[model samples]
Target: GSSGSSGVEPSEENSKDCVVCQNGTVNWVLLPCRHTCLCDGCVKYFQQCPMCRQFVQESFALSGPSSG
Candidate 1:
């Protein structure tokens, strides 16, 4: 239900995985908080940013802007 901080780990390791599942296609960011620590699957399960505990009113789909 909860995982990862806004950032910063004592182990000094950062991975590209879902803060919740840690085994999914990571590609989401919590709005207002602007924390990029969510995967498409988990983002749909939480109401607050797992990283900073901010209201997830709008987790932007920041996979990438493919305006090509």
Candidate 2:
């Protein structure tokens, strides 16, 4: 028998958990590295995520490692 399908939100199913905010969702911004973790609201207004300042496709090889 097939069970009912569960309805999961995009963020809930895809976005990773932000280490900085804990409760925040981690959406991978196109720019900078894939470290930025901005909720739906923050990603809409801010060009950069404060947690990870690296711009889209921004180099980080010299910076060592990401804090977030």
Candidate 3:
């Protein structure tokens, strides 16, 4: 058997907990590793997720978390 879903998976469902803030919804995804654990608030200040601890090669918006 396996442990609980520490989550941080690319799927938006298990990624509600912000990997950075832990208080927001995952709105952005870190690249290469494809981990969507960063919310709009925490998105601007991350090159990687604390869970994986790897710098993203690139990033993409999941909930369209962009402001122009």
Against the reference, the lDDT scores of all candidates come to 0.72, 0.49, 0.68
lDDT by residue (tens digit), candidate 1, 11-55? 734465677777675677788877767777788788887778887
Model 2 per-residue lDDT tens digits across residues 3-65: 886774555543455444556654545354555455544554456556656555431222334
Select the stronger candidate by lDDT from 1 and 3.
1
| lDDT (10s digit) by residue, model 3, range 8-63 | 65555443567556776676777777777777667667766656867878877775
**Which stretches of model 2 miss by more than 4 angstroms?**
1-16, 19-24, 57-68
TM-score of each: 0.63, 0.34, 0.56
Please give the range of 10 consecutive residues that has the lowest summed lDDT in model 2: 58-67
Higher-scoring candidate on lDDT, 1 or 2: 1
Residue pairs with colliding backbones in model 3 are none
Ranked by lDDT from best down, the candidates are 1, 3, 2
